[PDB]
């Protein structure tokens, strides 16, 4: 029907109209999408982690009709450390995929849940084994494998990692270019190569990923290629910020403050520290206070002018 | 919509041209700093010198050291670093590029190399590396860091190629086992240069970190190797940071024992190695010695020590006088002489029980109150042997004076065990 869930999405997405009582009426009335709707309510109100047991009840009821619950259950079992229920769920998922009941991308997303360090202890080996079984039928999972091996070197060396990236770069997934850029940037599984980093990050940024912009900005800022390039750093960091990377704004405020080969300009540093406050940190406001006490009132007013002129980023 | 621009900051302030401001001893090695292209800085007195000479006493000592090593069965390869000016003049700004007399400095540098060659030293000719103009494909691989006194690994490699050419033409290289090596980029370093730091505190400014490739050299049934027969003595320039000994192994094709360490200067690494039992039980066929025009080559207290050590100090030898004493604060009279102990035939060997002793401050007493006050200082950047070895003085009339007493200054507090032997020199045998 796709009826109750889009309606709940409407009632929550713009509360210009209760929603929990409407879901309770749809549930007392026995409408089978009531539980999926209340799970959606939990995720949008930010209470999901407080009702994991009921999420399990709902999705274990709805599993055979609503394969997204495979991802939900897995999440619950990763959060609450339940290896037994997770083994059972993965068994039924392998079966469902064999029977043709669940698409390969659902297996991919479950594997990526199993390897999400932010959920608790991961099961990266099981994730690898699922991805390797649906990768031939779902090429995106090659990149998933490439990222898994990258975060978990346990499961593969750099040659293994590159084999994955090559099988996925046949689809030329921009994520693959981003991963190569990060690999040469971070110097973790290989010695850092700023030139190869720059090339693959440039490829990634021309294809969509604004995070490549963050990395390029940092690269020109520090000078890993041999020389600091101030304007390129500003341009790329600014694109990342205008794309939704918060760490970029603070970066720019650092760039206009620290010297290190870049001429300090306190007003623009001010603008960007203020922008960085969207997700504030101690260092953020501390830089902001130092800069603010360094400026005069007329400088502060001109800086507020740029601040307001930059929040006038329509960006939609 | 709004545009935000950024600028590269900070030509050297005019105040750094004021020689008045380099007052401390450290600052004196930077007098004075001049701005060049990019953030290349240069020290006028050391980087842009035109004069590479020493005194006749210096040349006589260098000759004696060569001949003494040769009697011990060691050939020496002198690596005499060309200056930052000589190599990277083309990064200078037009004014300084036109004031620097590169032809005169080049000629005098080559003349000092020929002088070294005249005494028997094997001298790799590093002048072809001066006036560097990198190929387009090597744009960032400058011989020297822009704001620091050390070569980059690329400079070290370029010097190593020439040193290996010299070693392959050397008869001593015969009989030395051959070994293949592989050298790879292994990581990246960031140099906050000394010149940039001094500039920064003189002008209240700040410099970017210069990043640079690090390199590593690995040896590639009974394929394991015996002991090195080539030893590298040197400074921080030969340390792990720049892989000089790695490149030497790679291009010589043989093992190289690296005994350099930062802070050793002209003589620290050498003095510590010569006193070692590695040198006395496995003396090398070839010793490569790395230094630069920065060091005065006429310090008598350095060469009295090196020459005493080349004669193995006072061991396996009858003692003329000996002391086994516990020093206390103040003056401590270790030995009092009858026998005609003639300075020119004598050496002193002093070992402290505590290997952390870095300074020997002592007095050699001769006839009628004539005395020599000595102060020997070990580098504070390496674990050293607590041992001080020195020939008696031989300049002016000193060579004939007769030795009467030897006393040593105690520690500021506490007590310290010391042993001292006075002996005759042999002629640099076993
Ligand atoms: Cl996820
Ligand atoms: Ni922004
Ligand atoms: Ni700083
Ligand atoms: Ni010779
Ligand atoms: Ni050769
Ligand atoms: Ni160093
Ligand atoms: Ni006196």
Author numbering:
A (entry chain B): 138 to 154, 159 to 457
B (entry chain A): 29 to 248, 256 to 372, 378 to 470
Q: What text comes from the article?
A:
Alginate is produced by a synthase-dependent exopolysaccharide secretion system—a conserved molecular mechanism in Gram-negative bacteria for manufacturing and exporting carbohydrate polymers, including cellulose, acetylated cellulose, poly-ß-d-N-acetylglucosamine (PNAG), Pel, and alginate. Synthase-dependent systems are characterized by a membrane-embedded glycosyl transferase involved in polymer synthesis, a cyclic-di-GMP binding protein that regulates polymer synthesis, one or more periplasmic polymer-modifying enzymes, an outer membrane-linked protein with a tetratricopeptide repeat (TPR)-containing domain, and a ß-barrel porin through which the polymer is exported. In this study, we focus on the alginate proteins AlgX and AlgK involved in polymer acetylation and export, respectively. The AlgKX protein complex reveals the molecular details of a crucial protein–protein interaction involved in alginate production and provides fundamental insight into how a polymer modification enzyme and export protein function collaboratively in synthase-dependent secretion systems.
To understand how AlgK and AlgX interact at a molecular level, we co-crystallized Pseudomonas putida AlgK without its native signal sequence (AlgKPp33–484) and full-length P. putida AlgX (AlgXPp1–479) and determined the structure of the AlgKXPp complex to 2.5 Å resolution. The AlgKXPp complex crystallized in space group I 4 2 2 with a single copy of AlgKPp and AlgXPp in the asymmetric unit. In the AlgKXPp complex, we were able to model eight TPR motifs (R3-R10) in AlgKPp (residues 138–452) and residues 29–468 of AlgXPp. The N-terminus of AlgXPp (residues 29–37) adopts an extended conformation in the complexed structure that could not be modeled in the isolated AlgXPa structure, suggesting that the extended N-terminus of AlgX may be disordered and dynamic in nature, thus requiring interaction with AlgK for stabilization. The AlgKXPp structure reveals that it’s mainly the N-terminus of AlgXPp (residues 30–37) that interacts with TPRs R9-R10 of AlgKPp, however additional residues outside the N-terminus of AlgXPp also interact with AlgKPp. PISA also calculated the interaction interface to have a buried surface area of 1015 Å2 mediated by 12 hydrogen bonds and one salt bridge. The side chains of AlgXPp E35 and AlgKPp R404 form a salt bridge, while the main chains of these residues interact via hydrogen bonding. To understand how specificity might be conferred, we next examined the surface hydrophobicity of AlgKXPp, AlgKXPa, and AlgKXPs. This analysis revealed a highly conserved, hydrophobic patch on the N-terminus of AlgX that is buried in a conserved, deep hydrophobic groove on AlgK. Examining the surface electrostatic properties of AlgKXPp, we discovered an electropositive region spanning 44 Å across the surface of AlgKXPp that extends from the active site of AlgXPp to the concave surface of AlgKPp, from R9 towards the N-terminus.
